[PDB]
Write a protein that binds this ligand. Structure first.
Ligand SMILES: CN(C)[C@@H]1C(O)=C(C(N)=O)C(=O)[C@@]2(O)C(=O)C[C@@H]([C@]3(C)OC(=O)c4c(O)ccc(Cl)c43)C[C@@H]12
Ligand SMILES: CN(C)[C@@H]1C(O)=C(C(N)=O)C(=O)[C@@]2(O)C(=O)C[C@@H]([C@]3(C)OC(=O)c4c(O)ccc(Cl)c43)C[C@@H]12
Ligand SMILES: [Cl-]
Ligand SMILES: [Cl-]
Ligand SMILES: [Cl-]
Ligand SMILES: [Cl-]
Ligand SMILES: [Cl-]
Ligand SMILES: [Cl-]
Ligand SMILES: [Cl-]
Ligand SMILES: [Cl-]
Lengths: 195, 195
């Protein structure tokens, strides 16, 4: 079938859902494409090249709140952005694991640039602006990884693990998202006072 | 050489540092032990069994602030516990990736039980107590994963990525750790008031 970038990524993302990250190979991507391995090699040099492209394409396709609404509070932007990132990570099997170990692609540099600028415009230094955004990203990544991977107890543990499996991680994630944002705001608001 | 659990884990953890999680195999653990694969199979049934045991052993060996000091504020406990967890995850190559996809082993049930109880004793419901501890765990896991895996820019991005690589993730992690704990405290302190 067709072997333009878009077609190669469609098959590879569909295969990822079948196989996971561990069992995804170039040879079986060739299978799905109705093609021989050396044909595919022309288009994609190996598994590392492929995952890199899938990581970039998972953001472009499905992370659609990368940018603040005109007038949006910084708080609300980190909220919506966190939720979008999570959902984009959740849309494919092992998607957090696909995302792990890549930086933003050229194509989105200006988007991470705008995110960082937007924060500095709301009273953050570039550093504290970065730390808050990184924090959102690491909390969000960790919660999706744990969620996606979880796919004689003592009393409080038995009851805690019933509360963890009673959804897809959403409740726990959104509660701790609010703790993080308020924590940032408490930092922001104090300026140079001891807090 | 000796094939008691402790010896098998010592070699496997040392091999993990050589190889990573991807390239760690039973066959090469047999190599390191001066033994044949079928001998090792008696002791360890496969790679999944091994990683499960390495995940448990990474905590037992190196995560030594699993418990509050008598009199410790809940804040300070989450701090020290977060730092310890991080450091235990950082001590081996792909240690976050080894930890991902296991729950606490029997051996530490009472420790996670005590953690949860301790929080309920300081004004948390079991749920909000769980959400704060899970949040610490997901933030901490995500920051180590990103750190351990990172092993024409626009101006703010160029400068942000210089600040991210200027240490091992410690600065960014500890700053966002404090945002999280204060965020929790703002939640705790409000009781039933709108906040
Ligand atoms: C979830 N969001 C907060 C961010 C985001 O909106 C995007 C995105 N492309 O829209 C990201 O790339 C993010 O999801 C994201 O993962 C990147 C991350 C950050 C700060 O930017 C970086 O360039 C960068 C990096 O190179 C290494 C680590 C980290 Cl945490 C980063 C910013 C993330
Ligand atoms: C880093 N610490 C906050 C915790 C901790 O001290 C320990 C530990 N053995 O000492 C953990 O197991 C932790 O590091 C840890 O990873 C577990 C985690 C928790 C709430 O307990 C669970 O039993 C559990 C679970 O089954 C699934 C997900 C999560 Cl987040 C959890 C608690 C973590
Ligand atoms: Cl074609
Ligand atoms: Cl195309
Ligand atoms: Cl708003
Ligand atoms: Cl939220
Ligand atoms: Cl022996
Ligand atoms: Cl032993
Ligand atoms: Cl204290
Ligand atoms: Cl801290």
């Amino acid at each position: 079938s067709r072997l333009n970038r878009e077609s190669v990524i469609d098959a590879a993302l569909e295969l990822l859902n079948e196989t996971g990250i561990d069992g995804l190979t170039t040879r079986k991507l060739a299978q799905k494409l109705g093609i021989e391995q050396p044909t595919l090699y022309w288009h994609v040099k190996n598994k590392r090249a492929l995952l890199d492209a899938l990581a970039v394409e998972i953001l472009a396709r499905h992370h659609d709140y990368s940018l603040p609404a005109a007038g949006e509070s910084w708080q609300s932007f980190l909220r919506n952005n966190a939720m979008s990132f999570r959902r984009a990570l959740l849309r494919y099997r092992d998607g957090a694991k696909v995302h792990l170990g890549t930086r933003p692609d050229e194509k989105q540099y200006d988007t991470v640039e705008t995110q960082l600028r937007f924060m500095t415009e709301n009273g953050f230094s570039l550093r504290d602006g970065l730390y808050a955004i990184s924090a959102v990203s690491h909390f969000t990544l960790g919660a999706v990884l744990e969620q996606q991977e979880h796919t004689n107890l003592p009393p409080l543990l038995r009851e805690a693990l019933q509360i963890m499996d009673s959804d897809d991680g959403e409740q726990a994630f959104l509660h701790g998202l609010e703790s993080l944002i308020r924590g940032f705001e408490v930092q922001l608001t104090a300026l140079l006072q001891i807090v």
